[PDB]
Amino acid sequence: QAPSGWWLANIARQGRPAFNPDPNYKIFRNVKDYGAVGDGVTDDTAAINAAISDGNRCGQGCSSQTTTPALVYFPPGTYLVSKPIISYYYTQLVGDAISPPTLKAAANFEGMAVIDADPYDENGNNWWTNQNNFFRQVRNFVIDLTAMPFEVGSGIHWQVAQATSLQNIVFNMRTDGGDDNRQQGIFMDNGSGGLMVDLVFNGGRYGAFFGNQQFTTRNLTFNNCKTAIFMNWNWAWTFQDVKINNCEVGIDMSNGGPDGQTVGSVLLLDSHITNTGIGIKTAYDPAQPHTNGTLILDNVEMTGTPIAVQNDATGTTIVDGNQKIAFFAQGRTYGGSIGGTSGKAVQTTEQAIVKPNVLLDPATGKVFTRSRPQYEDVPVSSFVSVKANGAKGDGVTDDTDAIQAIFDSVTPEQIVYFDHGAYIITKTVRVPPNIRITGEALPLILAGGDSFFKDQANPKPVFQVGQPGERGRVEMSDLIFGTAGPQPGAIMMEWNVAGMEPGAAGLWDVHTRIGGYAGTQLELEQCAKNPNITNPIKPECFGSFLMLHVTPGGSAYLENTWYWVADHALEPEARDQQIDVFNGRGVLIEGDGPVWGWGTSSEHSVLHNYQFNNARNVFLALIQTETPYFQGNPDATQPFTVNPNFADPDFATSCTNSPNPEQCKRAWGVRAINSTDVFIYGAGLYSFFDNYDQECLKTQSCQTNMVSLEGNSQVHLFGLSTKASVNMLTVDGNAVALDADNRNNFCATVAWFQS
Ligand SMILES: *[C@@H]1O[C@H](CO)[C@@H](O[C@@H]2O[C@H](CO)[C@@H](O)[C@H](O)[C@H]2NC(C)=O)[C@H](O)[C@H]1NC(C)=O
Ligand SMILES: *[C@@H]1O[C@H](CO)[C@@H](O[C@@H]2O[C@H](CO)[C@@H](O)[C@H](O)[C@H]2NC(C)=O)[C@H](O)[C@H]1NC(C)=O
Numbered sequence: 001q002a003p004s005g006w007w008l009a010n011i012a013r014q015g016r017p018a019f020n021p022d023p024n025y026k027i028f029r030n031v032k033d034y035g036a037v038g039d040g041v042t043d044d045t046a047a048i049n050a051a052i053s054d055g056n057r058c059g060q061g062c063s064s065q066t067t068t069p070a071l072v073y074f075p076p077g078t079y080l081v082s083k084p085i086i087s088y089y090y091t092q093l094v095g096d097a098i099s100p101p102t103l104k105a106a107a108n109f110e111g112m113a114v115i116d117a118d119p120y121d122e123n124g125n126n127w128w129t130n131q132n133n134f135f136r137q138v139r140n141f142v143i144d145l146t147a148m149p150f151e152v153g154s155g156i157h158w159q160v161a162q163a164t165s166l167q168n169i170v171f172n173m174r175t176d177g178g179d180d181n182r183q184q185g186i187f188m189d190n191g192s193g194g195l196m197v198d199l200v201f202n203g204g205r206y207g208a209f210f211g212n213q214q215f216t217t218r219n220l221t222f223n224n225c226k227t228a229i230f231m232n233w234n235w236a237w238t239f240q241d242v243k244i245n246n247c248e249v250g251i252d253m254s255n256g257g258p259d260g261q262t263v264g265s266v267l268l269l270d271s272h273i274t275n276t277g278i279g280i281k282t283a284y285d286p287a288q289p290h291t292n293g294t295l296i297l298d299n300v301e302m303t304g305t306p307i308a309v310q311n312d313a314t315g316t317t318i319v320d321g322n323q324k325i326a327f328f329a330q331g332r333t334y335g336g337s338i339g340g341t342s343g344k345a346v347q348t349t350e351q352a353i354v355k356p357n358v359l360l361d362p363a364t365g366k367v368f369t370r371s372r373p374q375y376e377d378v379p380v381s382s383f384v385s386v387k388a389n390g391a392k393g394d395g396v397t398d399d400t401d402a403i404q405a406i407f408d409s410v411t412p413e414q415i416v417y418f419d420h421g422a423y424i425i426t427k428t429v430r431v432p433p434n435i436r437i438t439g440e441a442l443p444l445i446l447a448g449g450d451s452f453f454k455d456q457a458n459p460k461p462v463f464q465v466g467q468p469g470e471r472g473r474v475e476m477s478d479l480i481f482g483t484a485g486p487q488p489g490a491i492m493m494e495w496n497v498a499g500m501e502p503g504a505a506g507l508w509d510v511h512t513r514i515g516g517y518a519g520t521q522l523e524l525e526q527c528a529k530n531p532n533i534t535n536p537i538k539p540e541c542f543g544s545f546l547m548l549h550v551t552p553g554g555s556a557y558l559e560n561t562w563y564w565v566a567d568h569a570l571e572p573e574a575r576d577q578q579i580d581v582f583n584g585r586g587v588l589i590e591g592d593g594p595v596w597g598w599g600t601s602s603e604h605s606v607l608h609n610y611q612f613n614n615a616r617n618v619f620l621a622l623i624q625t626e627t628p629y630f631q632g633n634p635d636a637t638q639p640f641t642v643n644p645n646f647a648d649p650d651f652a653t654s655c656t657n658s659p660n661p662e663q664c665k666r667a668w669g670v671r672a673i674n675s676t677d678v679f680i681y682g683a684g685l686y687s688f689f690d691n692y693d694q695e696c697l698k699t700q701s702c703q704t705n706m707v708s709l710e711g712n713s714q715v716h717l718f719g720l721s722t723k724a725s726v727n728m729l730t731v732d733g734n735a736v737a738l739d740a741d742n743r744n745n746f747c748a749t750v751a752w753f754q755s
């Protein structure tokens with residue numbers, strides 16, 4: 001096939017990792033420049049693998065690395081492969097977006113999967129610790145297993161962590177062989193996700209075999225699979241806009257049986273299970289001692305599917321199909337008339353969860369969604385390269401004025417293109433309310449300087465997105481925001497603009513990465529942990545003030561956005577060793593929004609990871625947090641002073657008279673103050689340490705409190721999982737749901753909180 005003309009294939013390549021010492025390292029690789037023929041006849045395995053591995057990248061024996069990113073581009077074509085495509089650390093596998101190429105497994109293909117994102121060596125050790133396998137894309141492919149015997153074949157071994165995505169992939173598999181068919185689209189053994197969007201699975205035994213701590217996956221279609229989704233294990237998982245068609249089983253979540261369920265919780269929203277034998281197989285019964293197997297259905301059609309939910313241990317139909325299920329919950333519920341203050345285990349349909357119209361797509365009535373833009377129809381001439389227009393991206397030069405001048409002059413038909421590099425910002429950059437910005441494989445935008453962002457008593461925005469009250473169209477994608485040295489006055493992104501329409505203002509694959517990597521000066525040398533002393537709280541190890549602030553009137557659509565304060569060092573010489581980085585606050589949302597967050601995560605801030613203050617119209621699915629591992633050395637009262645301008649939590653006051661005082665002063669996973677119409681569909685809010693000691697896990701008591709609802713906040717929580725917090729949820733100062741009353745297979749889990 002002809003080249004597609006997609007801008008990405010032809011845009012001038014001027015990028016380079018600023019902190020890789022090799023001036024000739026090449027981030028972009030077109031597989032055909034490595035000898036791939038793309039005709040489906042010549043075996044292209046070696047050429048594709050060489051395009052990935054070229055340049056001394058992070059493969060076997062390399063724990064992790066941020067200075068060897070790669071964007072591996074596959075022009076339109078068919079690529080015959082006979083062994084796995086090994087995706088090295090920090091790789092974007094980018095098929096052509098206009099005409100997604102086919103990865104065609106040879107009949108004699110051998111190996112784990114057509115694409116392997118985390119190989120096992122001969123001794124059974126992964127190349128990368130699964131929970132550290134960050135910063136990846138696979139997008140725009142057809143993966144064809146149909147030449148392989150039905151007894152073998154997996155499309156992608158997707159064993160990954162945060163800031164990863166699968167997008168726009170079709171998996172074509174055989175339908176013959178009965179019980180001996182073993183083909184599957186995704187094979188996922190474990191990990192810590194992550195996002196998937198816009199996938200189609202045709203045939204096979206399983207569309208996907210899934211096992212992971214937590215994941216958000218939406219707009220998935222399954223056609224003629226035996227079981228569409230085999231959920232092997234999880235803590236939580238949120239599915240939205242899933243279409244299952246003519247399968248034997250939709251979601252199998254009964255692994256382990258009624259006395260050993262390995263699936264923690266599943267949420268299924270805005271979905272359709274059509275012409276399928278059994279919609280969902282579960283082993284849950286409300287008399288069981290634990291919360292394993294929790295399930296939420298919200299707005300799910302069951303057309304032509306006579307058994308919507310089946311208890312496959314007893315064989316009993318729990319919910320009849322051939323009707324829409326407005327809402328179903330099984331697991332423990334609190335609040336309202338059903339659960340009350342003590343909580344109650346239930347397995348029942350119930351009344352619809354009504355969401356405000358501002359959060360919905362008016363065309364479908366589903367919660368609004370929009371995938372990461374790839375600008376397929378935009379000509380290369382419309383892209384304005386920052387390096388072509390005066391920004392150096394060298395990680396030292398002050399690029400503030402050059403970037404500001406680009407932002408001030410770019411027209412709405414153009415797109416600002418951040419060539420890969422590291423762009424030092426030394427004072428506030430004002431982003432206008434009409435702009436589109438996209439990056440070459442996660443360029444770094446770093447708050448730097450020696451004064452402007454240094455004062456936590458007088459914090460300042462790094463990127464100020466619109467001015468207060470403005471409406472417009474602002475899109476950013478494929479970028480990382482961070483600090484160069486400590487910048488405890490930096491508000492990394494202040495989001496003032498509101499979209500003209502849903503999805504017109506947002507962030508896709510845009511991450512805030514505070515410390516831990518080359519260029520930050522916040523690495524193992526400077527910030528190594530020392531739990532054996534009282535922490536000095538080194539000034540050289542502070543991070544930012546606040547990673548994201550949606551101010552009153554701001555409205556944003558966030559999808560695949562990781563707000564991460566480093567718990568460990570990311571370059572290979574450090575061997576994943578742990579560090580202390582002191583970052584005040586994660587994500588703060590105020591005002592009437594709306595705000596959507598799909599597949600967001602906020603981890604290791606001191607005061608809170610997510611906070612809603614005087615907020616309305618917030619939809620998050622699913623969310624994930626961690627407390628910083630150094631707490632309580634120091635505890636959450638240090639080193640950021642309480643600032644009422646950000647409604648900061650005041651732990652010295654709030655923990656007064658705590659019955660569990662030793663571990664009370666710890667970062668909030670989620671805090672809501674005077675906020676309503678907030679909807680959280682799935683949450684994994686974890687506390688794994690106390691001053692790097694994990695003894696507290698044995699009694700699920702690393703911290704005292706995890707979610708705080710204050711000022712009669714109406715926060716509608718579904719599939720809330722928390723790890724090792726005595727109290728999962730506290731309302732107006734009273735502990736409501738205790739971990740001990742809601743034990744799952746690892747976390748504790750509340751299916752449904754009625755506010
Ligand atoms: C769900 O994802 C699928 C897969 O990307 C989308 O289907 C593609 O839609 C585009 C735009 O119409 C077409 O050009 C492609 O041919 C489609 N691909 C396939 C495999 O069908 C689909 O649009 C998405 N649906 C929603 C509601 O977002
Ligand atoms: C929920 O998960 C827990 C943890 O896996 C299950 O408890 C385990 O059950 C297995 C039997 O399959 C035992 O071998 C383990 O010793 C148990 N561990 C603990 C910590 O109790 C529990 O049975 C599951 N509950 C339900 C209702 O499925």
Ligand SMILES: *[C@@H]1O[C@H](CO)[C@@H](O)[C@H](O)[C@H]1NC(C)=O
Nearest residue numbers: 527528529530531532533692
């Ligand atoms: C803290 O003490 C332990 C002994 O339990 C030791 O192994 C570790 O190296 C010490 N840490 C530092 C930073 O010295």
Ligand SMILES: *[C@@H]1O[C@H](CO)[C@@H](O)[C@H](O)[C@H]1NC(C)=O
Nearest residue numbers: 614615616673674675676711
């Ligand atoms: C609490 O939220 C309401 C909106 O329901 C708002 O009118 C009120 O001003 C808020 N209270 C404070 C103290 O800001």
Ligand SMILES: [Cl-]
Nearest residue numbers: 165372509560
């Ligand atoms: Cl993404």
Ligand code: NA
Nearest residue numbers: 408409410432
């Ligand atoms: Na302008």
